Amino acid sequence: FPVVLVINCGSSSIKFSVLDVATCDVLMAGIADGMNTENAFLSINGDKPINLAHSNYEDALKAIAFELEKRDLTDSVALIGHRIAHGGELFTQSVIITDEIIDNIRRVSPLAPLHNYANLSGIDAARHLFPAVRQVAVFDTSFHQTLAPEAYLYGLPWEYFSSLGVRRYGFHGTSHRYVSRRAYELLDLDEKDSGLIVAHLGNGASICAVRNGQSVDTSMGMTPLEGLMMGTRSGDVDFGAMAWIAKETGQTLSDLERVVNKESGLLGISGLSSDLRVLEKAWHEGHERARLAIKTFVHRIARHIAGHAASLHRLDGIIFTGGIGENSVLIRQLVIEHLGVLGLTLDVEMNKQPNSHGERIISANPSQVICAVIPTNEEKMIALDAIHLGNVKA
Amino acid sequence: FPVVLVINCGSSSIKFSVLDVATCDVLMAGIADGMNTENAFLSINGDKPINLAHSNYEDALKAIAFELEKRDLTDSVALIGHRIAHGGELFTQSVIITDEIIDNIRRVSPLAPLHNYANLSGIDAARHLFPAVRQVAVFDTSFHQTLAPEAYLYGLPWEYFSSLGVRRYGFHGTSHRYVSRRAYELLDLDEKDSGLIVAHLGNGASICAVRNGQSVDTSMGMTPLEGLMMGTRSGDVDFGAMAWIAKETGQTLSDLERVVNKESGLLGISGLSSDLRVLEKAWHEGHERARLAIKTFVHRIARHIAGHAASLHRLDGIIFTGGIGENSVLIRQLVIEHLGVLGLTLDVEMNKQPNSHGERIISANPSQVICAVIPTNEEKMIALDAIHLGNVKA
Ligand SMILES: Nc1nc2c(ncn2[C@@H]2O[C@H](COP(=O)(O)OP(=O)(O)O)[C@@H](O)[C@H]2O)c(=O)[nH]1
Numbered sequence: 014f015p016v017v018l019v020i021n022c023g024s025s026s027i028k029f030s031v032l033d034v035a036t037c038d039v040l041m042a043g044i045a046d047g048m049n050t051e052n053a054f055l056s057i058n059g060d061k062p063i064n065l066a067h068s069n070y071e072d073a074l075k076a077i078a079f080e081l082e083k084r085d086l087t088d089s090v091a092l093i094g095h096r097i098a099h100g101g102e103l104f105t106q107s108v109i110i111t112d113e114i115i116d117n118i119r120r121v122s123p124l125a126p127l128h129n130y131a132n133l134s135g136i137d138a139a140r141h142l143f144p145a146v147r148q149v150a151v152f153d154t155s156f157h158q159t160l161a162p163e164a165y166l167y168g169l170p171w172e173y174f175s176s177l178g179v180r181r182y183g184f185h186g187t188s189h190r191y192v193s194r195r196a197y198e199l200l201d202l203d204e205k206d207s208g209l210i211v212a213h214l215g216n217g218a219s220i221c222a223v224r225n226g227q228s229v230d231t232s233m234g235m236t237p238l239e240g241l242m243m244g245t246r247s248g249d250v251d252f253g254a255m256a257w258i259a260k261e262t263g264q265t266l267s268d269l270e271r272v273v274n275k276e277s278g279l280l281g282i283s284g285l286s287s288d289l290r291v292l293e294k295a296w297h298e299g300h301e302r303a304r305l306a307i308k309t310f311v312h313r314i315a316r317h318i319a320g321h322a323a324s325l326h327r328l329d330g331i332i333f334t335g336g337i338g339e340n341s342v343l344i345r346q347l348v349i350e351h352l353g354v355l356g357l358t359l360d361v362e363m364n365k366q367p368n369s370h371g372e373r374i375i376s377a378n379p380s381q382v383i384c385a386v387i388p389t390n391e392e393k394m395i396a397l398d399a400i401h402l403g404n405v406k407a
Numbered sequence: 408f409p410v411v412l413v414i415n416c417g418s419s420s421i422k423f424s425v426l427d428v429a430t431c432d433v434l435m436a437g438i439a440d441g442m443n444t445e446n447a448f449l450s451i452n453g454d455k456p457i458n459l460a461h462s463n464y465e466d467a468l469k470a471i472a473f474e475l476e477k478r479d480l481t482d483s484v485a486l487i488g489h490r491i492a493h494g495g496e497l498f499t500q501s502v503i504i505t506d507e508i509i510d511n512i513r514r515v516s517p518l519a520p521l522h523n524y525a526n527l528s529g530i531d532a533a534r535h536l537f538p539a540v541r542q543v544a545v546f547d548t549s550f551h552q553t554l555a556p557e558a559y560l561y562g563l564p565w566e567y568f569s570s571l572g573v574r575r576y577g578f579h580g581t582s583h584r585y586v587s588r589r590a591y592e593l594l595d596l597d598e599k600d601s602g603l604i605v606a607h608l609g610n611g612a613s614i615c616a617v618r619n620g621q622s623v624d625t626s627m628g629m630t631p632l633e634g635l636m637m638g639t640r641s642g643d644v645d646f647g648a649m650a651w652i653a654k655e656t657g658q659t660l661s662d663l664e665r666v667v668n669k670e671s672g673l674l675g676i677s678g679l680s681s682d683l684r685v686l687e688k689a690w691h692e693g694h695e696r697a698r699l700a701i702k703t704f705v706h707r708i709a710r711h712i713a714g715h716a717a718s719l720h721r722l723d724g725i726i727f728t729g730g731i732g733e734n735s736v737l738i739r740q741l742v743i744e745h746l747g748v749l750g751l752t753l754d755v756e757m758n759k760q761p762n763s764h765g766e767r768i769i770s771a772n773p774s775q776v777i778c779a780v781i782p783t784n785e786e787k788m789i790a791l792d793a794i795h796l797g798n799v800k801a
C-alpha cells in the first residue's frame with residue numbers, strides 16, 4: 014500500500030500531506046508553523062501540537078521523517094511531491110527532480126525570492142531523508158505557460174521583457190488545471206472544444222480562462238498582486254494613483270509594496286477582517302464598510318470573469334473554487350447576478366447547498382452558461398502528477 | 408450670427424475652436440503650440456503660422472483676441488467653453504463659470520496638477536478679454552460621477568479614499584457622453600433602457616460602460632495611466648512587477664512614473680512609434696515587434712470591453728471612436744474578432760469604409776450586438792453645453 018508525501022514550504026510554514034496512491038485519499042495531514050521563530054510548533058492532524066524552538070526547514074522535515082517512521086509509514090513513501098511557487102519560463106509541466114531541475118529552479122528564484130528559496134530548502138531536506146524515493150516538482154506557474162505573448166506582455170518598454178523577464182506569469186495554476194480537468198467530466202464537455210472560466214477564490218484569488226484545455230488568460234501577473242481584490246491584497250491599482258500617493262505621504266515603492274500586499278483588499282476597505290465569514294455576518298448586521306468591501310470584491314470578480322471570457326471562442330462554463338468559491342453562497346450569487354449580461358441564470362436552492370455536496374451545478378437549466386462549484390485539491394493534483402511520473406524510466 | 412469660442416489649454420499648448428451657435432459648425436480652428444518655450448507659435452487654420460517668443464497662457468490668448476477682432480468675430484462671441492481636465496467629486500455636469508466655480512476647480516487641482524492649473528490660466532485669461540461674455544466649464548471627469556462606490560474604489564486601505572481622495576475618476580467623459588447621445592439615435596435605442604460600451608481609442612485610450620444613459624464603469628482611474636495600453640502609456644501594470652523592477656534597476660517611483668507615461672505602450676513594445684499608421688504598415692512589412700504591440704493593444708481592448716459589459720444588464724452596442732476607433736479598419740476588426748464570445752459578427756465591407764462615412768454600423772445583421780463607428784466631437788459637446796447654459800438666468 015504505497016503513499017505519496019506532498020510538501021508545501023511557505024514563507025513561515027511547511028504544510029504536508031500523505032496520500033494513498035490507489036485512491037488519492039489523505040491518510041495524514043499536518044503543518045510545521047512558525048518557521049525560523051523561537052516558537053516553532055508541528056501539529057499533525059491536531060492530535061498532538063508537538064513543539065520545537067528555533068529550527069530550520071530541514072529540522073522541521075526531519076521531525077516529520079521521525080513521526081512517519083513512528084507510525085510505520087516510512088517504507089510506504091513511494092513518491093514525494095513538491096509545490097513550487099515559480100517556474101519562470103523554464104517549466105511548462107511537472108517534472109521528476111534531478112540536479113538539473115534544482116539548478117533551473119534556482120535560476121528562476123529571483124522572480125519569487127521569498128517563496129522559491131523556501132521550496133528549495135524543502136527539496137534539499139526531503140532529498141536527504143528520502144534519497145531512494147523519486148521526487149517530483151509541481152509549479153504554480155506552469156499551467157499558464159500556454160499564454161500567447163499578447164496575453165502575457167505588459168505595455169512596458171520591450172527592454173524590461175527581453176532583458177529582465179518582466180511579463181505575466183499568473184498563479185493557482187495547479188488549482189486551475191485540476192478544476193478544469195474535473196469540469197470536463199461534470200459538464201460533459203469535450204476538452205478539445207471547450208471554453209471555461211475558473212474563479213479561484215480564497216485569501217489569494219485569481220481568474221483563469223481555459224480554452225480547449227489550455228490556459229489562455231489569467232488575472233495574476235508577474236506577482237500575486239495583480240488582478241482581483243483579495244483578502245489583504247488590493248488587486249489592480251492605478252500606478253499613477255500610487256505615484257500620487259507617494260508625493261503626499263513621502264512613502265517609497267517598498268512602503269506601498271507592503272500596504273498593497275498586507276494591509277489592503279477586504280481587510281483594507283472594511284477595516285475589520287480579511288475573512289469573508291466575518292464580513293458577511295458584519296453586513297447582515299448593517300456594517301457599511303463591510304458591505305462595500307464585499308460589493309467591490311464582487312464587482313472586480315465579475316469584471317475579470319467577463320474580461321477573461323474574451324479569450325474564449327465560446328463560453329461553456331464558469332467554475333467557482335477555493336475557500337470562498339466553495340463555501341460562500343452570497344458571493345457566488347452576487348457575482349452571477351452581476352453577470353446577467355452573459356445570460357447566467359442561478360438556481361438558488363442549488364447555490365444554497367454547502368460544500369459537503371462537492372462538485373455541483375448551481376445554475377438553472379435555461380442559463381446560457383453552466384455555473385458550478387468544484388472543490389480544489391492541489392495536494393491531489395500534485396500526487397496524480399507524481400503517480401504518473403512514477404512509471405517513467407529516468 | 409453668434410458663435411461659441413472653445414478653449415483647451417494643455418500642458419504645452421492652447422487648442423481653440425470657433426463654432427456657429429445655430430449649426431455647431433467649425434468656422435475657425437487653431438493651436439498656440441510650444442507654451443512657456445522660447446519658440447511659441449500660433450497657427451490658425453494653417454494659413455499663417457504666426458510666431459511669439461517666451462509668452463504666457465494669457466499672451467497666447469490675447470493673440471487670439473486680436474486675431475478674432477481682425478476677422479471681425481469679437482462681437483459674435485456669445486459664449487466661451489473651457490475644457491477642464493479634472494472636476495474631482497465637486498462637478499457632475501457642465502457649469503456656468505463664477506468665482507465659486509474657480510475656487511472649486513482650484514480645490515480639485517491637486518488631483519491633476521499639470522493640466523488643471525493650465526485650465527485655470529485659460530479661464531483667467533479668457534475672463535479678462537471677454538468679461539461681458541458668459542463662460543462655461545466642461546469637465547473630463549463629470550460623466551463618470553454616476554459610478555457606484557464598488558466601481559470606483561480601489562482595494563487600498565479605506566484611509567486613502569476618505570482622507571486623501573484616492574479613487575477611480577476616469578476620463579474622456581465628454582467624448583463618452585457625446586458618443587453615447589449619438590448612439591441612441593443611430594441604433595434606435597431608448598436611452599432609459601440601454602447598455603452601451605464606448606471604446607475611445609486615440610493616443611490616450613479608455614473604455615466606458617453606459618447603462619441607461621449613465622456611466623457605470625470606465626477604464627481609466629485616478630490618472631490616465633490605468634486601463635488600456637495606449638500610445639506611450641502602459642495601461643494596467645502589476646504593482647508587484649513595478650516594485651520588482653525598482654529593486655533591480657535602482658529606479659524610483661518617479662523614474663518609473665515617466666517610463667509608464669511617456670516611454671511605454673505601443674511606442675514601448677514596438678520600439679518604433681506610438682502612431683498606429685506607422686505600426687500597421689510596419690506589420691504589413693513583417694515587423695515582429697510592431698505586430699506584437701498591435702496584438703497586445705487589441706487583446707487589452709477586448710478584455711476591457713468584455714469586462715465593462717459586466718456592469719450592464721443587457722449589451723446593445725459597442726461604439727468605436729477617437730483617431731484609432733474612427734480610422735483603423737484593422738484594429739476594429741481584430742477587436743471584434745476577439746469578441747466572438749459576445750456573439751459579434753462583423754460586416755467587413757462596412758468596416759472597410761473610411762471616416763468620411765461618419766456615423767455608421769459596421770456589424771452584420773445576425774450579430775447579437777450592434778457595432779458602430781461614431782466620430783467624437785468634444786468641441787461640439789462643449790459648445791452644446793454652453794448653448795444650453797446660455798438660456799439660464801444667473
Ligand atoms: N462565506 C464563507 N467564506 C469562507 C468559509 N470558509 C472559508 N471562507 C473564506 O475563504 C478563505 C480561506 O480560503 P482558502 O482557499 O483556504 O484560502 P487560502 O488561505 O489562500 O488557501 C477565508 O479567508 C474566508 O474568507 C465559509 O464557510 N463561508
Ligand SMILES: Nc1nc2c(ncn2[C@@H]2O[C@H](COP(=O)(O)OP(=O)(O)O)[C@@H](O)[C@H]2O)c(=O)[nH]1
Nearest residue numbers: 608609610611681682683684729730731734735
Ligand atoms: N490606422 C489608422 N490610425 C490612425 C489614423 N489617423 C490617426 N490614427 C491613430 O490615432 C491617433 C490619434 O488619434 P487622436 O484621437 O487624435 O488621439 P489624441 O492625440 O489623444 O487626441 C494616432 O496616434 C494614430 O495612431 C488612420 O488614418 N489610420
